[PDB]
Every structure is written in C-alpha cells, then in structure tokens.
Amino acid sequence: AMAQEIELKFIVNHSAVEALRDHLNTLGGEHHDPVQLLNIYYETPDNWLRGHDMGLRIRGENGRYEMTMKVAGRVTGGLHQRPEYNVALSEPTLDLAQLPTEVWPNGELPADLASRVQPLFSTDFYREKWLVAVDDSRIEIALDQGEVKAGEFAEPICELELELLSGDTRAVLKLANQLVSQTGLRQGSLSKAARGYHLAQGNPAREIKPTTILHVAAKADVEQGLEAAFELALAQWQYHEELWVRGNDAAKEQVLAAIGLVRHALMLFGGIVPRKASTHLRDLLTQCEATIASAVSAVTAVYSTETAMAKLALTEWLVSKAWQPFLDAKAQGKISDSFKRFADIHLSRHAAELKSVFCQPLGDRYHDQLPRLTRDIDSILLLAGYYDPVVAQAWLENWQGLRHAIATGQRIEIEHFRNEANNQEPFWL
Ligand SMILES: [Mg+2]
Ligand SMILES: [Mg+2]
C-alpha cells in the first residue's frame, strides 16, 4: 500500500524567523544545521497529476536523489494528511515503474505518462531541523526558507512544518500549542506543490469563493454532517485569510463570515453538542474577531496570537472530535441518526425564523436583523444539500440578495428581495 504523511504547516512572517529559530533552540531536541533541498516537480500539458490532487518530484540533497509521489488526502487548517511513496534514486531520472499500482487511479500507469511529463516548477530552499519527543510520539520540526519557481514566476518560501514521524496526531497539536504563544505563525493550507502549480499558470490573482450549499454523502449520520460543516467553515477561513494576507482587502469580510459560520454551526448542532463543549473555543473566536475588526494591517491581524490561538483551537476541536466525550446516551442516539432527516427538521425551523422576521417591511430597522438573517442563511447552507442544487440555491438566492442589500443600504433592492423571498415556497419535505 502507501505510506501516510501527517504534518502541520505554518507560514512564518519574514520578520519573525530569527526569534522563531531562537525559541526552537530552547526545546532541547536534536538539531541539524540548514541543508539545501533542490526539487523539480513534473507535470503533463493537460495538468493530469494536478487534476487528481497528486504531486510528483525528484528531490536532491547534496547529490543524493529521491523520487516522491504524494496523492489526494485531507487538509484541515494547517494539517496535511496525504498518502505518499518515496523511492531512492541513483541519479536524477524518474522511474515510474518503481511506484506501486495503487498510486494510479486506474491501477496502471498511463502508457504515455513518462513521455509527456515536463519539469513544471522547482522548489529551492534551505531546511533546518529539530527532532523532538512529545509523550510517546516523535516529531521532526522543519524550518524552510527559499523559493518556489515556475519559469518567470516565483514567490518566497518561509514556513515551519511539524511532521509526525510516529505516534499520535494529538502530540503534534500539543507541540503547536506551545509555539503559537508568540506572533509570526499562521496555519497554511497550500502545499509547496499547490503554490508551484499556481505560479505555472502565470500566478493569476485568486478570487473570493462565496460559500455554497454543503453536500454530504447519502446515508451520512448527523456526526458526519457536523464534521463536514466544520471542515467547510475552517476551509473557508483558511482560503480567505490566505487571500487577505496576500493583498485582497475584500477577503477580510469573508474571514469574518467564515468565523460566523463556525459559530452558526455550533448553534445548529447545539441540541446534540452541549454549549460547554465549546466554551474556550468561542472565547478565543471573540478575541480573534475583535483583533480583525480593529486591525490596521492584515499581516498584523493574521499573524497575531489572537488569530493563531483561535485557529489552532478550532483545528484541534475538529481533528480530535472534542464533542464526543460530552455526549450523553440521548445525544449519541441523535448524532448517530440520519443527517437527511435532521436537516428536514432544521430547514423548517430556520424558515419559520426568516418568515416571522421579514414578513413585513422594517423601515430603518433592517440592519439590526443582519445577525439573525446571516445565522439562518448559514444554517440553510449547511442543511440544504440533499435537494436539487438549482432549486435550493435559487431559494437561498433571494435571502442572500436581501442580506447584501441590507448590508450595503440599497432601499429598493431590500424591498425587492424581501418580496421575492416571501413569495417563494419551500423546497424540502
Ligand atoms: Mg512538507
Ligand atoms: Mg514532510
């Protein structure tokens, strides 16, 4: 089969590198001085490997070569969990026959793959390492500094990785908790390969991604729905934070919206997961929101300890499934039942709230209802996924139009969408 890589990635603010290196040196690990890693990644003209979330490189460490294939896995905040397979090489030339068949989607290497792959991008960086023990786990800390480059287009590498060599993922999260007491770290959801692929397309500006309806598997239980909901909210926070720190000022609003979605998900599942399961998480989210609101700089806001601690708290809560020990028998029964059936009930609950609030025109008092309206839209986004996507998104579009118009003060559009929303019927059972 494949091996399994588990590592937590933090992007490091450039000014914080020296202070980080000093801190890492107080942990009492086995330290290795920087070594240059030279990598070339390979890809076809039709972006075949990228289409499968899989990356192929040859790594050089002082004339010693290694071929590595990573395949589709999971990214949760900064935590990358990818299957991989590494093969030692005698010289820098690919040998695709050495990889197991389970690497390939069809169980067979495409006939022309070796012939049509070209060098698409490189990563050239110096890696400094600390090996540390946390409980019964062993973790390799890597500090990477250099470049990722696709022809003309390059961007800096300045990041920290905590790779689990053996043991438990909880140990990685424990280690992270010590490090985010100081500024200069943010969880990074983009692999070096993902950034390399983007540069190779001419490094176009990334666009804001509005949240769309969550689609959870048929037969999923409520717990699976909950996991998918929090995965989505964290992914939307990560994506928009990356855009914001890269210079998109409009993305700030979407960072706050994603944090709002976390809160609304906690409320949605609050009949099952008690409020006390998320006391500390919600406290940290409040301080993060305040820091974001008052920030003069995206860089300062994003690399702050308020943001760092709040984000790590959410990642840990999700990955550790921290709700589980709080569930009594009744709650366990409800969380193990159908998400589809749960969703039908809660769609009606949120529709009742929307109808009662917006059945009449509200004059100068629309803006005070924004939090309620936003909660209900967010809740329906998480719940509406078992129906026809065209019908369901069309239903939501009218409430979303109302929310936009209220937020920007468009009097005509407020009344238009309020009427459209009150004239449409429900789509659910
Ligand atoms: Mg890595
Ligand atoms: Mg690694």
Residue numbers in the entry: 0 to 428
Excerpt from the paper describing this PDB structure:
The Vtc4p β-tunnel domain is not unique to eukaryotic polyP polymerases but is a structural hallmark of triphosphate tunnel metalloenzymes (TTMs), whose characteristic features are the presence of a topologically closed hydrophilic β-barrel, the preference for triphosphate-containing substrates, and for a divalent metal co-factor (PFAM families CYTH and VTC). Members of the ancient triphosphate tunnel metalloenzyme family can be found in all kingdoms of life. Our comparative analysis defines that most of these enzymes share a common catalytic mechanism in their tunnel centers, yet they have evolved different substrate recognition modes on their tunnel entries. The observed substrate plasticity apparently allows TTM proteins to act on a wide array of enzyme substrates and to perform very different reactions, many of which likely remain to be discovered.
YgiF shares ∼18% sequence identity with AtTTM3 and has the same catalytic activity and substrate specificity. The structure of full-length ygiF was solved using iodide/sulfur SAD phasing and reveals the conserved TTM fold (r.m.s.d. with the AtTTM3 tunnel domain is 2.0 Å compared with 172 corresponding Cα atoms, and 0.65 Å comparing 75 corresponding Cα in the tunnel center). ygiF contains a second, α-helical domain, which is connected to the TTM by a well ordered linker (residues 201–221, cyan in Fig. 3C) and which has been previously annotated as CHAD domain. We next solved structures of ygiF in complex with PPPi and in the presence of either MgCl2 or MnCl2. The ygiF triphosphate substrate is bound in the same conformation as observed in AtTTM3, and we could identify two metal co-factors. One Mg2+/Mn2+ ion is again found coordinated by tripolyphosphate and by Glu-160ygiF, which corresponds to Glu-169 in AtTTM3 (position 1 in Fig. 3D). The second Mg2+/Mn2+ ion is coordinated by three glutamate residues from the acidic patch in ygiF (Glu-4ygiF, Glu-6ygiF, Glu-162ygiF) and by a water molecule that is positioned close to a terminal phosphate of the tripolyphosphate substrate (position 2). Taken together, our experiments define two consistent Mg2+/Mn2+ coordination centers in plant and bacterial TTM tripolyphosphatases. Consistently, changing the corresponding Glu-6ygiF and Glu-160ygiF to Ala impairs the enzymatic activity of ygiF, suggesting that the proper arrangement of metal binding sites 1 and 2 in the tunnel center is essential for catalysis.
